Design a protein around this ligand. Structure first.
Ligand code: PLP
Ligand code: PLP
Lengths: 396, 396
């Protein structure tokens, strides 16, 4: 039966990891991956999280199933984080949230929900975009189209081209937006550009789907959400797929959420039932541990203060490395200008390196990056900044 | 967009729970649910599990992503549990295992794998069967057919009818088998019937898919696996979807596994890559906590001894309640014979009650059971055995 099944193609990111396995050279530098690293080059467990797992270990008295939509506390604490404490969306009960196995899980759930309960046929993703986006939606039977976004020449958001390709999008189509810290360009819209997109969106009749996986890594918790909040102010219906993998360092516990917003509570409750049905035939109910931790931290004043501070330390270290990277490049006498990376947000940025330069950095310097030129700034430390930069200057 | 989405039908089991919410009567008795209860009527966390979560809390130093197939230790410890320590399947590297979010998750993964990489079109499930079986496979686009299994009149396995309906199954079709503790009849094949099915299976060219969610609840760990091991001895290819929700009391941590077996390692590795691809577009990687616990217990001699003993206490309590139930019924002067429930295994058994009797027990006695007459024996205690039985005698 499995006679002639063809081997699956190597993943553009996960497969890159294997190459690191074989390479036994000492000084290797991993700028692919996709997770946070600290000065040491490690991916530790947050203190707030350890304290939370302590609490759960002494209070849990059962591991009985969670409802299909997960922990109720996790849900409202998530909606407050996304829309704001006094948000009208919450007061009118226009939103429902399902705890999901990661942000990726929220995307699949949304995709299954849409393909089986709506007339949606096309989804628009930015160019470039996190490769897994197209895969998840295609897997659900939806076609994925692309809209201009990145200006390769000026290393900026080509707002015009963006708007010009979105016009080809009909009413009823889904348009996916990265909430903040766009993956992989690291270029996000300005608040005014967001407002312009929210209006244009309401006119054309698009269904907005926000992928919010890095809230807190651009400017801050509240600041990073004004984009999504601008859309939510004018939209009748929305879908937000969020993740806590990064801002909590809970990657392997698979902690995310899919929030559905409709015109009124009557409607959202009805649409949500079908979303719960989509989940029932997938994994049945979400894993508790990871979500349990998040809820505990967010609902406890003390613990929430510690976490916010820890989040801030992560945000600033990345902002540090961005500056230390540009400067060292000049110090080593890098060819052209790289100051544009200081204008970008989050862990990722396009280095502007050619496929061949990436290939040369890896083969001749053990420096690992995605063929696209995407580098994970969080993988840079004061220790490897010099050997790293020197190698880059060698391939320019 | 969510304008006229129709409400989803109530789930046959999960929806029954709500009725318990509204009912405020004190003496209620919940025999639906589907999880284990102890003398107290609670669903505690195993001691072995608490000790394991203790260990993980002091040793975990990162929450970095697990590989798509999860924790490697979890995988081999699972294959040893299923096939036996010296199993030839393991020595020849003919099996690959993916850690999945629950047993339900393993089923969806298998379904997605089959619908996208094989010629499979039909899946055969027993009649009756765990309702969610049909849903999961239909969701993947496969059609589900049924084969006779339960003899409603004699409360036994109608082996003949079983064989007669399976003949209508063509080569290339998938046949699903409950490893042990059949849900909901509680009737399993004898070892000789298993061997007869394994042979018949190899001749007809069926692809066996075992749903193994209750290993350890019938006779014991090793005993409960001789069925699956009988098939694995003669089959080139198999698929086992197992769960640790029950024998570990880890329901909400979603801990399961999907094992793929092929003719040789070369082939299984190729087929597995596509299975990893199916997982990549679903939830990406499995949650660690739950699986981490299982691996820790199974690989530690001391802890594994404590868990086995705890498993045995669960198995025997259920065997106790089965006897205490039949006897009390006679004591209360029940109408007919119920001795057949002592011949059945696991937490479930068909009481042989009519839809109307079930409805009457619930409305007039707060006694809750599935409309099908399925009762969860693990929900009976020495405390509620009398009020329970009296009510049953009232509706006979
Ligand atoms: C990291 C990321 C996610 C979420 O991934 P998690 O493991 O699933 O929760 C989603 N979208 C993008 C663009 C991401 O970079
Ligand atoms: C309980 C059960 C499972 C597995 O469920 P879990 O929550 O998903 O792991 C699978 N099949 C049957 C028939 C079951 O009763």
């Amino acid at each position: 039966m499995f006679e002639n099944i063809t081997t699956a193609p190597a993943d553009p990111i996960l497969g890159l990891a294997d190459l690191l396995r074989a390479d036994e050279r000492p000084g290797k530098i991993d700028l692919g991956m996709g997770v946070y690293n600290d000065e040491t080059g490690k991916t530790p467990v947050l203190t707030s999280v350890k304290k939370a797992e302590q609490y759960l270990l002494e209070n849990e008295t059962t591991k009985n199933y969670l409802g299909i939509d997960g922990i109720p506390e996790f849900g409202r604490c998530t909606q407050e984080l996304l829309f704001g404490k006094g948000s009208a969306l919450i007061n009118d009960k226009r939103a429902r949230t399902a705890q999901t196995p990661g942000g990726t899980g929220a995307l699949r759930v949304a995709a299954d929900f849409l393909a089986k309960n709506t007339s949606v046929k096309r989804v628009w993703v930015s160019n470039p975009s996190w490769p897994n986006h197209k895969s998840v939606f295609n897997s659900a039977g939806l076609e994925v189209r692309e809209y201009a976004y990145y200006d390769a020449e000026n290393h900026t958001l080509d707002f015009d081209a963006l708007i010009n390709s979105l016009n080809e999008a009909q009413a009823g189509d889904v348009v996916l937006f990265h909430g903040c810290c766009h993956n992989p360009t690291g270029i996000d819209p300005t608040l005014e550009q967001w407002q312009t997109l929210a209006q244009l969106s309401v006119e054309k009749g698009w269904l907005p789907l926000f992928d919010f996986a890095y809230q807190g890594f651009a400017r801050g918790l509240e600041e990073d959400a004004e984009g999504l909040r601008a859309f939510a102010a004018m939209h009748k219906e929305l879908i937000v797929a969020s993740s806590y993998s990064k801002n909590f360092g809970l990657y392997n516990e698979r902690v995310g959420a899919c929030t559905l917003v409709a015109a009124d509570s009557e409607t959202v409750d009805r649409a949500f039932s079908q979303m719960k049905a989509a989940i029932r035939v997938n994994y049945s109910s979400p894993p508790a541990h990871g979500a349990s931790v998040v809820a505990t931290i967010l609902s406890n004043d003390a613990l929430r203060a510690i976490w916010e501070q820890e989040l801030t330390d992560m945000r600033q270290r990345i902002q540090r490395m961005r500056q230390l990277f540009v400067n060292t490049l000049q110090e080593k006498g890098a060819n052209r200008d790289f100051s544009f990376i200081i204008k970008q947000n989050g862990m990722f940025s396009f280095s502007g390196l050619t496929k061949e330069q990436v290939l040369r950095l890896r083969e001749e310097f053990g420096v690992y990056a995605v063929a696209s030129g995407r580098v994970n700034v969080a993988g840079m430390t004061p220790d490897n900044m010099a050997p790293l930069c020197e190698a880059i200057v060698a391939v320019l």
